[PDB]
Structure formats: C-alpha cells, structure tokens
Amino acid sequence: YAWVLIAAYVAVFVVALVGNTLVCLAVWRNHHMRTVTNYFLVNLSLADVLATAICLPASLLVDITESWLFGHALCKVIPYLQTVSVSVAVLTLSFIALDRWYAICHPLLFKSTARRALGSILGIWAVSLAIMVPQAAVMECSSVLPELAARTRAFSVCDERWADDLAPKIYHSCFFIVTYLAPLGLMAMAYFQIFRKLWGRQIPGTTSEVKQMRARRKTAKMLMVVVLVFALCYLPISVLNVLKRVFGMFRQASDREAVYAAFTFSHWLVYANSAANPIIYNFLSGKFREQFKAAFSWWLP
Ligand SMILES: CCCCCCCC/C=C\CCCCCCCC(=O)O[C@H](COC(=O)CCCCCCCCCCCCCCC)COP(=O)(O)OC[C@@H](O)CO
Ligand SMILES: CCN(Cc1cccnc1)C(=O)CN(c1ccc(OC)nc1)S(=O)(=O)c1ccccc1C
Ligand SMILES: CCCCCCCCS[C@@H]1O[C@H](CO)[C@@H](O)[C@H](O)[C@H]1O
Ligand SMILES: CCCCCCCCS[C@@H]1O[C@H](CO)[C@@H](O)[C@H](O)[C@H]1O
Ligand SMILES: CCCCCCCCS[C@@H]1O[C@H](CO)[C@@H](O)[C@H](O)[C@H]1O
Ligand SMILES: CCCCCCCCS[C@@H]1O[C@H](CO)[C@@H](O)[C@H](O)[C@H]1O
Ligand SMILES: CCCCCCCCS[C@@H]1O[C@H](CO)[C@@H](O)[C@H](O)[C@H]1O
Ligand SMILES: CCCCCCCCS[C@@H]1O[C@H](CO)[C@@H](O)[C@H](O)[C@H]1O
Ligand SMILES: CCCCCCCCS[C@@H]1O[C@H](CO)[C@@H](O)[C@H](O)[C@H]1O
Ligand SMILES: CCCCCCCCS[C@@H]1O[C@H](CO)[C@@H](O)[C@H](O)[C@H]1O
Ligand SMILES: CCCCCCCCS[C@@H]1O[C@H](CO)[C@@H](O)[C@H](O)[C@H]1O
Ligand code: NA
Numbered sequence: 001y002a003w004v005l006i007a008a009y010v011a012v013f014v015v016a017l018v019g020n021t022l023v024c025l026a027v028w029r030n031h032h033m034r035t036v037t038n039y040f041l042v043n044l045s046l047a048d049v050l051a052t053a054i055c056l057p058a059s060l061l062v063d064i065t066e067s068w069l070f071g072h073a074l075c076k077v078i079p080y081l082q083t084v085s086v087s088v089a090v091l092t093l094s095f096i097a098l099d100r101w102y103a104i105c106h107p108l109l110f111k112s113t114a115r116r117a118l119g120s121i122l123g124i125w126a127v128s129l130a131i132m133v134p135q136a137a138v139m140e141c142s143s144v145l146p147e148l149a150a151r152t153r154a155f156s157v158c159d160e161r162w163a164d165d166l167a168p169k170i171y172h173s174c175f176f177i178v179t180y181l182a183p184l185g186l187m188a189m190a191y192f193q194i195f196r197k198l199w200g201r202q203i204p205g206t207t208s209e210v211k212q213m214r215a216r217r218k219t220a221k222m223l224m225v226v227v228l229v230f231a232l233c234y235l236p237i238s239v240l241n242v243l244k245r246v247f248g249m250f251r252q253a254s255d256r257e258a259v260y261a262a263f264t265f266s267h268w269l270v271y272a273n274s275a276a277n278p279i280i281y282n283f284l285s286g287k288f289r290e291q292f293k294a295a296f297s298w299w300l301p
Contacts, residue, residue, distance in 0.1 A: 002064055008268055009060040012275045016052040019278025020045040026291035033287060037219060039117040040096045041281070043124065047088035048274035055082040056271050063264045068141055068158035075141035075158035083135045086179055086234070086270075087128035093227060094183045095120050100223065101190040104197050104216060131178075134171070138162065172245035180238040184231050191224050222284035226277060233273035236266035 023045040027033045058078045061069055068075055099117070102110050140161040143149035149156065162168045198217050206213075240263060243249040250259040281288035 005063065005264065005268070006060070009056065009271070012268065012271050013052060013056050015279070016048060016056075016271065016274035019275060020049050020052070022292055022295050023278050023281065023288070024049075025295070026288060030291065033291070034114055036099055036112050036114055036117045037096055037223070039114055039121065040092050040099070041277075043092045043121045044089055044277060047085045047092065048277065050088075051082060051085040052271065052274045054078065055085065059267050059271070062158070063267055065154070066260075067154050068156045069153045070158075071153075072141045076136045076139045079139050079158070080132055080136035083132040083179075084128045087132060088124055089230070089273075090179055090183050091124045091128060092121075093187060093230060095124065096223060097187040097190040097227070100194055100216075100220065104194050104220075168245050172241060176238055176242050180234060184227070187227050191220070191227065194220050195224070218285070222280065225280055225284055229276050229280060230273060233269045233276070236262070237270055240266050 024042055027038045027042050055078055058070055058074070059082070070078065095117075099112055103112050138160040139158060141156060141158050144155045144157060148154075160168065198213065198220055240250075278288075278292075282292050283289070
C-alpha cells in the first residue's frame with residue numbers, strides 16, 4: 001500500500017504546484033483577473049504552495065517511515081508552517097465570504113477594493129504567523145530508544161509535549177473551533193444568504209446591475225464549491241485531532257493499523273485540497289479555464 005500512497009502524494013504534489021503557479025500567473029499577467037476575490041484566491045494558492053513545497057514531502061516521509069528524519073529545528077518549523085498555512089487558507093476563505101456577503105447582502109457599508117484586499121491579506125499572514133507560535137513551542141523531537149539517537153533518526157518522533165493533561169484538551173478544543181468549526185459555520189450561513197439574494201426574486205428597474213448579478217452567480221457558485229471541498233478535506237484531520245487530544249482516543253496497540261491508515265488518509269486529504277482548488281477554478285470559472293487552456297496549449301505544451 002506504500003507505492004499507492006507515494007504515487008497519490010506524487011500526483012497531488014505535481015498537480016498542486018503546477019495548478020497553483022498557474023493561478024498566481026493568470027492573476028499577475030491579466031488586468032481583467034485582478035478582482036478582490038482573485039487576489040484572495042492568489043493568497044489561498046500561496047498558502048497551498050507553502051504546504052505543498054515544504055510540508056508535503058516531510059508528511060509523506062513520516063507516513064511511510066513512522067519516524068521524524070529532519071532533526072530538532074525542523075520538528076518546530078515544519079509543524080508551524082503547516083498550521084500557519086491552514087490558518088491562512090481558512091482566514092482567506094473567511095475574508096472572501098465577508099467581502100461577498102457585504103457586497104451582495106449589505107452593499108453600502110464597506111468599500112470592496114483590490115488595495116484593501118492586499119491590506120486584509122497582510123493582516124491574515126500577520127495573524128496566522130502569530131497564533132501558531134504556541135504550536136511550534138510544544139513541538140519536540142525525541143528518540144524512543146535514546147542510546148541509538150546518535151547513529152540513526154529511524155526511532156526519532158516529532159510530537160507535542162504537554163506538562164499536564166488539561167492544557168492539550170483546552171488548546172485542541174480552541175484549535176478546532178478557530179481553524180474549522182466557527183469560520184466554516186459562519187461561511188455556510190453567509191453563502192446561504194448570498195444564495196437567497198442572488199437566486200431570489202428579481203427587483204424591477206435594474207440597469208444593464210443585471211450583468212454584475214449574472215457574473216456574481218457564477219463566482220458565488222464556484223466559491224460555495226471551494227468552501228464545501230475545504231470543509232470535506234479538513235473534516236477527517238480536525239475530527240481525528242479532537243478525538244485524540246480532547247477525548248483520549250486511539251491509544252490502544254490493538255487498533256495501531258486502523259489508526260495509522262485513518263490518520264495517513266486524513267494527512268493526504270489536506271494536501272489533496274491544494275491540488276483540488278485550481279481544478280475547481282478550471283471547471284467553474286471561464287476566466288481561469290481560458291488562462292489554463294492558454295498555458296497548456298501555447299505558453300508551453
Ligand atoms: C475564529 C473565527 C474567525 C473567523 C472570523 C471571520 C468569519 C467571517 C465569515 C463569514 C462572514 C459572514 C457572516 C454572516 C453570517 C450570516 C448569519 C445569518 O444571517 O444566518 C442566520 C441563521 O442563524 C441561525 O438560526 C443559526 C444559528 C447558528 C447555529 C449554530 C451552529 C454553530 C456554528 C458556527 C457558530 C459560530 C458563531 C460565532 C460566535 C461569535 C439568520 O438567517 P435568516 O433566518 O435571516 O435567513 C437567511 C436568509 O433567508 C436571508 O435571506
Ligand atoms: C494541531 C494541528 N493538527 C490538527 C489539524 C487540524 C486541521 C487542519 N490541520 C491540522 C494536527 O493534526 C497535527 N499536525 C499535522 C500532521 C500531519 C498533517 O498533514 C496535513 N497536518 C497536520 S502538525 O503539528 O502540523 C505536524 C506534526 C508532526 C509532523 C508534521 C506536522 C505537519
Ligand atoms: C512562491 C512563494 C510561495 C511560498 C509562500 C510564502 C509566501 C510568503 S507570505 C509572507 O511571510 C512573511 C514572513 O516573514 C511576511 O513578512 C509577509 O508579510 C508575508 O506576506
Ligand atoms: C446604513 C445602514 C445599513 C445597514 C442596515 C442593516 C439592515 C438589516 S437587514 C437584516 O440583515 C440580516 C443579515 O443579512 C438578515 O438576516 C435579516 O433578515 C435582515 O433583515
Ligand atoms: C479575526 C480576523 C483576523 C484577520 C486579520 C485581518 C484584519 C483586517 S486588516 C485590514 O483590512 C482592511 C479591510 O478589511 C484593509 O483596508 C486594511 O488596510 C487592513 O489593514
Ligand atoms: C513571525 C513569528 C516567528 C516565530 C515563529 C517560531 C517558528 C519556530 S522556531 C522556534 O519557536 C519556538 C517557539 O514557538 C521556540 O521553542 C524555539 O526557540 C524556536 O527555535
Ligand atoms: C473550552 C475548552 C474546553 C475543553 C474541554 C476539556 C474536556 C476534556 S475531558 C475532562 O477533562 C478534565 C481534566 O482532564 C477531567 O477532570 C474530566 O473528568 C474529563 O471528563
Ligand atoms: C469544544 C470542541 C471539541 C468538542 C466537540 C465534541 C462535542 C461532544 S459532546 C457529546 O454529544 C453527544 C451527542 O450524542 C453525547 O452523547 C455526549 O454525551 C457528549 O459528550
Ligand atoms: C466534530 C469532532 C468532535 C467529535 C464529536 C463526536 C462526539 C465524540 S464521541 C466520544 O467518544 C469517546 C469514546 O467512546 C468518549 O471518550 C467521549 O465521551 C465521547 O464524547
Ligand atoms: C463526521 C464524523 C464524526 C464521527 C464522530 C465519531 C465519534 C464516535 S466515538 C465512539 O464510537 C463507538 C463506535 O463503536 C461507539 O460505541 C461510542 O459510543 C462512541 O463514543
Ligand atoms: C465550551 C465547552 C466545551 C465542552 C466539550 C466537552 C464535552 C464533554 S463530554 C465528556 O468529557 C470528556 C471530553 O470533554 C470525555 O473524556 C468524556 O468521555 C465525556 O463523557
Ligand atoms: Na488547503
């Protein structure tokens with residue numbers, strides 16, 4: 001099953017790096033692509049490239065070897081970068097939802113500009129980089145057999161170190177709510193209201209307002225799919241983390257094989273999400289589809 005896992009990780013790594021570079025390039029090279037949503041979708045691609053390039057190979061080696069082969073320093077740095085990336089992704093999706101909700105449901109309160117989106121993007125990185133410092137603090141690299149640590153990294157493990165049994169329960173309950181449940185629950189409600197507004201009863205006297213509304217339905221439909229695919233890809237890892245850290249599950253040696261498989265699939269799924277988003281844009285955005293088609297047909301075959 002290791003060949004199947006390596007191949008799946010290789011496929012995801014290649015599709016994510018190519019797909020996400022194409023998203024960044026399409027927006028950078030084309031003025032018509034520089035919309036508020038597409039600036040945030042570029043930020044999602046930057047967070048997804050950070051995870052794919054630096055964290056995906058380390059995660060594939062842990063899932064294959066059942067050991068940490070990158071030393072003490074990277075045992076703090078790689079978990080930190082993976083968590084920062086999840087925070088940038090979820091906060092980016094939250095700010096898109098917020099932008100679309102105000103623009104469509106409450107149009108005359110806040111100004112939606114590309115320059116304000118760049119300020120929001122910097123804020124997302126500033127917040128994500130700071131709130132994940134406690135995650136890096138608890139990461140520790142230890143050898144299961146101390147007397148062999150000097151000759152091999154085979155029996156070395158990277159894991160969280162907690163001084164008491166209550167602190168990880170409080171921390172991981174907050175982690176789940178902040179990185180998954182509260183932003184996705186709020187986004188679901190925002191998109192339900194956007195759905196009712198865009199697909200609801202047409203108000204008469206609207207100007208050739210008609211074009212923006214048609215364009216908005218296409219974008220909202222795409223964004224709802226991105227949010228639903230994010231919710232599904234991050235559901236196993238989020239649930240497994242809570243059950244392990246808060247409810248003290250998966251500690252029995254008899255279950256080792258079932259637990260290994262479930263956690264390994266949940267780790268791959270996170271990375272599969274970085275590969276999924278450019279594929280979603282290709283099928284649900286004629287603008288991105290046109291750019292990707294140009295990239296594979298004449299920019300470079
Ligand atoms: C750390 C977080 C950081 C992220 C922060 C950024 C997150 C920003 C994301 C999006 C911004 C947009 C938010 C807008 C949310 C809009 C919420 C909303 O209005 O829906 C309500 C449903 O409530 C309801 O009964 C349902 C009540 C909630 C159900 C409980 C599930 C909890 C999951 C989530 C809980 C989070 C709460 C956060 C607490 C501060 C009322 O609808 P209503 O009837 O008018 O009909 C709808 C339709 O028919 C209108 O045409
Ligand atoms: C507390 C963080 N967490 C929960 C979580 C909920 C939702 C989204 N991501 C992570 C974990 O499961 C723990 N971690 C994890 C493991 C593999 C992986 O593959 C996508 N993703 C995250 S970790 O601290 O970032 C870590 C730990 C040890 C080795 C490598 C890494 C990246
Ligand atoms: C091709 C690039 C893909 C890798 C993704 C990483 C993007 C860099 S985010 C960057 O992190 C810095 C931390 O020092 C902050 O100073 C910046 O304000 C913030 O914007
Ligand atoms: C200049 C001030 C303009 C801002 C005034 C806000 C008007 C409140 S509308 C209110 O908004 C909610 C969220 O969309 C819906 O759930 C409700 O059903 C709907 O009645
Ligand atoms: C819990 C929320 C944490 C996410 C951090 C982002 C905070 C918003 S930054 C702020 O956003 C404005 C528009 O939103 C821009 O006009 C500004 O120039 C910029 O500085
Ligand atoms: C922009 C904010 C940058 C700081 C993020 C830290 C990245 C992991 S390095 C690591 O951080 C730990 C505390 O988190 C400490 O135990 C170590 O001394 C230090 O080597
Ligand atoms: C807002 C954060 C809320 C986190 C929820 C923590 C619940 C974990 S189980 C709970 O933990 C206690 C301390 O270990 C024990 O006294 C109880 O017997 C046990 O049932
Ligand atoms: C704070 C974030 C992490 C915690 C989320 C898990 C909530 C579990 S509550 C759970 O609901 C069940 C429903 O059937 C009851 O049977 C149980 O008695 C009760 O334990
Ligand atoms: C959405 C992610 C949060 C998980 C919510 C599902 C409810 C958790 S069932 C959990 O099962 C354990 C083993 O029987 C017990 O220790 C706990 O009492 C019980 O609560
Ligand atoms: C979105 C998916 C959420 C799934 C949450 C899983 C929580 C189930 S834990 C555990 O499972 C056992 C099955 O045998 C039951 O006997 C126990 O009563 C229960 O505590
Ligand atoms: C904001 C508060 C959030 C509270 C969510 C905790 C749900 C309590 S279920 C209860 O407690 C422990 C897990 O918390 C488990 O060890 C037990 O098996 C289970 O029966
Ligand atoms: Na992602």
